[PDB]
């Protein structure tokens with residue numbers, strides 16, 4: 001066919017649109033109906049298109065991803081599991097991106113230099129494991145993972161998996177990009193088929209066109225308020241309609257990115273001329289030309305059926321700001337000042353932060369600079385503190401060159417290193433005391449309790465970078481940039497003009513400094529050293545195989561009330577220091593979750609001593625004394641980040657099962673991967689029958705089977721017993737993970753010993 005390389009770094013790995021076409025055609029001969037775009041790319045990557053059972057929402061698909069991307073907070077545990085497998089080399093193109101361990105403190109270069117000293121052990125481990133197993137490595141300072149992927153690796157029709165829940169960002173270039181836990185990436189790097197429950201498809205028809213202050217971020221802030229944080233669970237969101245051509249390629253990536261906050265499996269846009277333009281400007285005109293020849297397979301079929309359809313008129317959309325503690329509490333910017341006032345949310349904005357993978361593009365920096373130059377023209381600077389994260393080294397070099405960085409510095413901003421930084425709590429914040437009630441507004445995507453600064457009383461609102469810039473200039477949530485007046489130096493009142501900016505540099509991008517490190521694909525005689533006394537890195541010891549018995553008289557470690565995100569289960573911020581050390585990071589287990597017994601975080605009754613104390617300490621006491629335990633959870637347990645540490649930590653501290661009203665997808669898959677039992681109530685009202693004092697017997701594990709419920713006997717202290725049924729979504733592949741003790745244990749059994 002054509003021999004067009006997958007990227008500039010892998011000149012030998014060719015795009016296989018011929019394979020894709022071939023597979024799409026096998027499947028449509030079987031289904032005899034129009035396929036959506038996500039169905040074309042997902043079913044086009046089936047390991048066995050001829051025999052795979054395909055029912056949306058019901059069958060598990062065995063897929064062959066094109067490439068794997070990992071960032072340094074999840075790559076450490078994915079590579080320690082890969083090192084346990086004993087396999088010598090990764091089977092598909094794979095990269096590690098170092099973006100999570102650079103703490104915001106001093107800004108830019110000084111923070112990068114410090115992170116390189118402080119995190120030397122970890123960066124060394126990843127570069128060495130990368131050289132040994134054939135994984136490309138983007139050095140600290142390269143940029144945030146999803147911006148490097150859009151710029152170098154994502155292309156129309158790719159199926160990419162990344163160990164990060166915002167991997168859907170790549171949907172802005174027409175690929176299917178899906179977030180997974182480190183153990184799922186091990187399957188694909190190992191070469192074994194990856195399984196994914198066949199998605200439902202929600203279609204979002206965009207009409208009209210964006211005007212003025214409304215930006216791509218407002219489309220997904222509105223969709224999140226409509227669908228709620230659990231409304232996209234088990235579905236791919238497919239954007240289509242005449243309004244699509246009004247959005248830049250990084251704008252489409254912004255909308256796909258935050259589809260993660262409604263629990264969607266991923267989001268995608270059809271190949272179009274804005275994508276083509278972005279591919280040409282990033283040195284991939286040959287890939288845009290090839291995609292032009294295969295265009296039919298890169299847009300939806302005429303008349304395809306969406307399981308749910310939502311229509312959004314871009315022309316009537318207004319600026320939104322979402323929060324404070326959920327990203328789906330959606331307010332128009334024009335009303336947030338009054339809802340805050342009524343609700344007791346602090347009205348002054350202490351810090352305005354632009355960045356994260358969701359909004360750190362060249363265009364986002366240009367639109368922020370366009371608001372800021374107007375303030376500067378009237379002798380104003382930011383009333384709030386203001387920080388700016390460029391998404392990649394290329395964007396940093398180019399916004400510097402094209403003058404936007406100096407405008408943002410002159411209004412009072414501090415440019416931070418090209419890294420997550422304050423978005424996962426890597427921020428040495430000292431303007432507030434812990435527990436001080438305050439408001440920050442960000443262009444990020446999540447605003448979960450204590451995630452940005454570990455202060456549970458910080459009220460964080462997420463919005464677009466141009467609205468963060470306008471609110472930082474005013475310093476108060478009571479400011480609508482569309483209607484209100486600022487007062488210049490000169491005494492005149494003036495109004496902010498809606499920002500206008502180029503979506504891409506007029507000249508070419510400036511690449512900035514060299515930050516990619518190709519594997520020696522020669523040498524690979526690297527020994528990966530993990531010191532046995534390391535506090536940051538620890539080799540894994542396998543979990544125990546299932547004993548063949550039912551689980552009786554299980555202790556409830558904690559019955560959780562309400563929202564319980566993976567940031568409540570395994571906090572980030574200061575704990576990122578231990579993402580390669582299981583025993584040390586297990587000390588944060590469930591410290592943010594609210595206990596229904598007393599409505600406190602990190603305070604549970606130890607059943608034996610009858611003292612209330614920290615959840616990790618109590619779990620370790622139960623483990624020490626042979627008491628097997630359970631967590632009881634409410635709805636959408638495990639919402640958020642893909643960090644498999646939220647599943648590895650309960651396994652390690654002696655947990656057996658997590659029984660909830662519902663689970664978020666990636667967390668439920670991670671629980672099964674680590675040999676725990678994720679179970680849901682067959683009647684959610686049964687959550688109210690279980691009291692923290694009850695003991696539970698899960699019965700029927702001997703004939704554990706797809707589609708058959710398990711019985712749970714609730715043993716009340718007064719002698720009363722009640723029996724309830726619990727559902728599971730295990731297929732026989734996954735029951736083998738549970739019988740072996742983990743998926744990694746099962747994989748190692750299949751290596752003939």
Ligand SMILES: O=C(O)C[C@@H]([C@@H](O)C(=O)O)[N+](=O)[O-]
Nearest residue numbers: 073074164165166641642643
């Ligand atoms: O905890 C992690 O490292 C992965 C994660 C992170 O980038 C996050 O935003 O919480 N995520 O979203 O998947």
Ligand code: SF4
Nearest residue numbers: 166356357420423424
């Ligand atoms: S959401 Fe924040 S922490 Fe996660 S990859 Fe994006 S910028 Fe980094």
